[PDB]
């Protein structure tokens, strides 16, 4: 069916844009800027706007995280799209914030977040939709409880918006946007694509591998703080795979026998939640080089890890990934065929990567007109994602401390970080690599 | 948890809507007259651009590429003469870029599609 399309990530960061290929647009007789009524899995409906994209396959439909969550749909699913010309300029539209993100934030959530987001853009809206508004160095969510034309609506300069406070609790079915997503990582686009091609199919279509081998060990290595955990969390989130973090220090802290039992039970639990992803953080802490280890209990725990990982063979649809600094950092026999047979090098983000990371970390931050992330990204040599995040945070702190001499969300949104603040934070960067 | 309570002050300024242009059937008749007044090139492809109005548009109209935005600016007034006394401004959407120059052809403006929404001038 022509209306069936495969969901894909969207380059356009706007919250209400659906990118489609021009051939498919004309075939569907869909004109850019028209409203579309997307149909989700569990009878979910999302009203958005279609936009052309040259770099898009005909069947592929590019979408933003917010719309995906609104439809309870993940990448690679099939959605139905049709034009919905029957849209009216609703007058009474009731929207509410979400408690988990507005806690400790005061001042009317209007003229600060809702007003600038809507203004006069004519953003389409549907009942029950969840959307995210960035401001005051915070990302506030909002739920469209009611709209004058039930259920579809489009805001208009004559639309009356009601924001009666009383933040609503997050229902368990909904997945909070605070969780890590594929757009939350910048710079390692090549490695990230490699990881997609490596792990998407086993988790998304397990029946194919059970019927028709799959990769069982991926070793992510690089300087500490490069966001390896971030990568694994994001991957688990989009693929809907159970995530189990096994911090190396946490296991090493446990006394002899307790640590091995904890590791064993972690693998067994992950197996019982198949499909699942196990992230062995700081693997070198668990299984250091043979020369480094000087204790029977460590060699015992290493042997136990090898035995369990070998037992994974009879298991399936469980992917184990670990974090290190260099392959030679861990002892041999761990990279032997099977166990950790595949490797990936996150490396250091490049100028474009640093720019992407800075943009990702400054989404909520209000930067002055003179602040340009490209020039600084060019200057910021040898900074890791953690370092870039800390630098942005330091600039924000510099701005806040400067303003304190003179919390109300209006005041918070009033202050804006300037290039001088970034230059000062830069002087205090303290690079880690 | 009543969804009809309190109030929120107006988003924007007052909008002077009258709609004193006769019964919409008359509007449709005048739109048909204006459409017939459009000179179809017969060679360049034809596209139907629908327009949104403050009260409500949906005014689908076939058009060509060689024309200028002055063509639509005049056709809208023809189909809605009341707009003659009410200056109108047309802008695209996402980005909401205001379409100022009229001398440019539609091909020059590469706007052969329904991003035509009317705002008070």
CB contact under 8 A, B3 and A17: no
How far is the C-alpha of A252 from the C-alpha of A66, rounded, in Å?
39
How far is the C-alpha of A121 from the C-alpha of A115, rounded, in Å?
11
- Is there a binding annotation on residue A229? yes
Q: Which stretches of chain A sit within 8 Å of chain B by CB? A: 14, 16-17, 31-34, 49, 51, 85, 88-89, 92, 94, 110, 115, 118-122, 145-146, 155-164
Contacts of A17 (CB under 8 A, 6+ apart): A10, A48, A49, A51, A64, B94
How far is the C-alpha of A345 from the C-alpha of A317, rounded, in Å?
23
| CATH code, residues A4-80 | 2.40.40.20
How far is the C-alpha of B63 from the C-alpha of B115, rounded, in Å?
14
Confirm if A353 and A188 have CB atoms less than 8 A apart.
yes
Coil, strand or helix: which one is A190?
helix
CATH class of A351-427: mainly alpha
DSSP string, A258-321: HHHHHHHHHHHHHHHT-SEEEEEETHHHHSB-TTT---HHHHHHHHHHHHHHHHGGGS-SEEEE
Give contacts of B 22-51 with A, CB under 8 A. Answer: 49-50
- Is there a binding annotation on residue A227? yes
Cα distance from N-terminal residue to C-terminal residue, chain B: 40
* Exp. method: cryo-EM
CATH class of A92-162: alpha beta
Of the candidates A198, A213, A217, A111, the one whose C-alpha atom is nearest the C-alpha of residue A161 is: A111
Closest-CA distance of chain A to residue B85, Å: 21
Query: What ranges do the domains of chain B cover?
Result: 24-120
Among all chains, which residue has been given the structure tokens 């002087």? A427
Contacts of A358 (CB under 8 A, 6+ apart): A373, A376, A377, A388, A392
Query: Would you call A430 exposed, middle or buried from its count of C-beta atoms within 10 A (0-12, 13-18, 19+)?
Result: exposed
Tokens representing residue A216 in the block: 């069982």
Query: Would you call A98 exposed, middle or buried from its count of C-beta atoms within 10 A (0-12, 13-18, 19+)?
Result: buried
Tokens representing residue A249 in the block: 């220090």
How far is the C-alpha of A347 from the C-alpha of A344, rounded, in Å?
9
Query: What ranges do the domains of chain A cover?
Result: 4-80, 92-162, 182-345, 351-427
User: How wide is the angle at C-alpha B10 spanned by C-alphas B7 and B11, nearest 5°?
Assistant: 120
Neighbours of B32 (CB within 10 A): 12
CATH topology of domain B24-120: Ubiquitin-like (UB roll) (3.10.20)
The conformational region for residue B22 under phi > 0 = left, psi -120 to 50 = alpha, else beta, is: left
How far does Cα B43 stand from its chain's mean position? 25
B14–chain A Cβ distance below 8 A for any pair: no
Alpha helices in A57-188 (DSSP H): 65-70, 99-102, 114-118
How far is the C-alpha of A30 from the C-alpha of A28, rounded, in Å?
5
Query: Would you call A115 exposed, middle or buried from its count of C-beta atoms within 10 A (0-12, 13-18, 19+)?
Result: middle
Contacts of A143 (CB under 8 A, 6+ apart): A95, A96, A97, A98, A128, A129, A130, A168
| Chain A residue with Cα closest to B9 | A160
Coil, strand or helix: which one is B118?
strand
- Is there a binding annotation on residue A135? no
Which of A85, A158, A160 is opposite residue B8, by nearest beta carbon? Answer: A160
Alpha helices in A28-184 (DSSP H): 65-70, 99-102, 114-118
How far is the C-alpha of A188 from the C-alpha of A70, rounded, in Å?
27
How far is the C-alpha of A96 from the C-alpha of A164, rounded, in Å?
7
Half-sphere exposure of A260 (CA within 13 A, CB side): 15
Cα distances (Å, whole numbers) of residue A179 to A33, A193, A238, A278, A433? 30, 20, 10, 18, 27
Compute the residue count for chain B.
121
Confirm if A32 and B115 have CB atoms less than 8 A apart.
yes
> Resolution of the deposited coordinates, in angstroms?
4.0
Q: Which residues of A137-175 are buried (b: 16+ CB within 10 A; e: fewer)?
A: bbebbbbbbbbebebbbbbbbbbbbbbbeebeebeeeeb
How far is the C-alpha of B58 from the C-alpha of A177, rounded, in Å?
36
Q: At what angle do helices A419-427 and A385-404 cross, to 10 degrees?
A: 120
Alpha helices in A131-211 (DSSP H): 189-204, 206-211
Tokens representing residue A177 in the block: 């946007």
Contacts of A331 (CB under 8 A, 6+ apart): A287, A288, A289, A290, A293, A302
| CATH code, residues A182-345 | 3.40.50.300
Cα distances (Å, whole numbers) of residue A367 to A357, A361, A405, A410? 15, 12, 20, 16
- Is there a binding annotation on residue A128? no
Among all chains, which residue has been given the structure tokens 């069982």? A216
């Amino acid at each position: 069916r022509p209306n069936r399309l495969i969901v894909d990530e969207a380059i356009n960061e706007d919250n209400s844009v659906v990118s489609l290929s021009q051939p498919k647009m004309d075939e569907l007789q869909l004109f850019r800027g028209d409203t579309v009524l997307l149909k989700g899995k569990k009878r979910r409906e999302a009203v958005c706007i279609v936009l052309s994209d040259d770099t898009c396959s005909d069947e592929k439909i590019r979408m933003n995280r917010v719309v995906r969550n609104n439809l309870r749909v993940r990448l690679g699913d099939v959605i139905s799209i049709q034009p919905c010309p029957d849209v009216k300029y609703g007058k009474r539209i009731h929207v509410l914030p979400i408690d988990d993100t507005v806690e400790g934030i005061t001042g009317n959530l209007f003229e600060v977040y809702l007003k600038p987001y809507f203004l006069e853009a004519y953003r389409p809206i549907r009942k029950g939709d969840i959307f995210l508004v960035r401001g005051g160095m915070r990302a506030v969510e909002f739920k469209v409880v009611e709209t004058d034309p039930s259920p579809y609506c489009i805001v208009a300069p004559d639309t009356v918006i009601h924001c009666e406070g009383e933040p609503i609790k997050r229902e368990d079915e909904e997945e909070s946007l605070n969780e890590v997503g594929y757009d939350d990582i910048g710079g390692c686009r090549k490695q990230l694509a490699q990881i997609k091609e490596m792990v998407e199919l086993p988790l998304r279509h397990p029946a194919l591998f059970k019927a028709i081998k799959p990769p069982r060990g991926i070793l992510l290595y690089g300087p500490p703080g490069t966001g390896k955990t971030l990568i694994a969390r994001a991957v688990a989130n989009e693929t809907g795979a159970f995530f189990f973090l096994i911090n190396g220090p946490e296991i090493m802290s446990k006394l002899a026998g307790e640590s091995e039992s904890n590791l064993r039970k972690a693998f067994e639990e992950a197996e019982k939640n198949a499909p699942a992803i196990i992230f062995i953080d700081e693997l070198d802490a668990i299984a250091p080089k043979r020369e480094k280890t000087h204790g029977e209990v460590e060699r015992r725990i290493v042997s136990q890890l090898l035995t369990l990982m070998d037992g994974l063979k009879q298991r399936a649809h469980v992917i184990v990934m670990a974090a290190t600094n260099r392959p030679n950092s861990i002892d041999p026999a761990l990279r032997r065929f099977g166990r950790f047979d595949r490797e990936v090098d996150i490396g250091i983000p490049d100028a474009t990567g640093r720019l992407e990371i800075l943009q990702i970390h400054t989404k909520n931050m209000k930067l002055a007109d003179d602040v340009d992330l490209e020039q600084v990204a060019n200057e910021t040599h040898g900074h890791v994602g953690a370092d870039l995040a800390a630098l942005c945070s330091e600039a924000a702190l510099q701005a806040i401390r400067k303003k304190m001499d003179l919390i109300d969300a209006e005041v918070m949104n009033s202050l804006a970080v300037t290039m001088d603040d970034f230059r000062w934070a830069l002087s205090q960067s303290n690079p880690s690599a | 948890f009543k969804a009809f309570t309190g109030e929120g002050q107006k988003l924007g300024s007052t909008a002077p809507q009258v709609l004193s242009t006769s019964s919409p059937a008359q509007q449709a008749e005048n739109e048909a007259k204006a459409s017939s007044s459009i000179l179809i090139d017969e060679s360049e492809p034809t596209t139907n651009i629908q327009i949104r109005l403050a009260d409500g548009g949906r005014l689908v109209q076939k058009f060509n590429h060689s024309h200028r935005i002055s063509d639509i600016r005049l056709f809208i007034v023809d189909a809605r003469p009341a707009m003659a006394a009410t200056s109108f401004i047309l802008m695209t959407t996402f980005p909401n870029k205001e379409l100022a120059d009229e001398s440019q052809t539609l091909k020059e403006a590469n706007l052969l599609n329904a991003v035509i929404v009317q705002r008070l001038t």
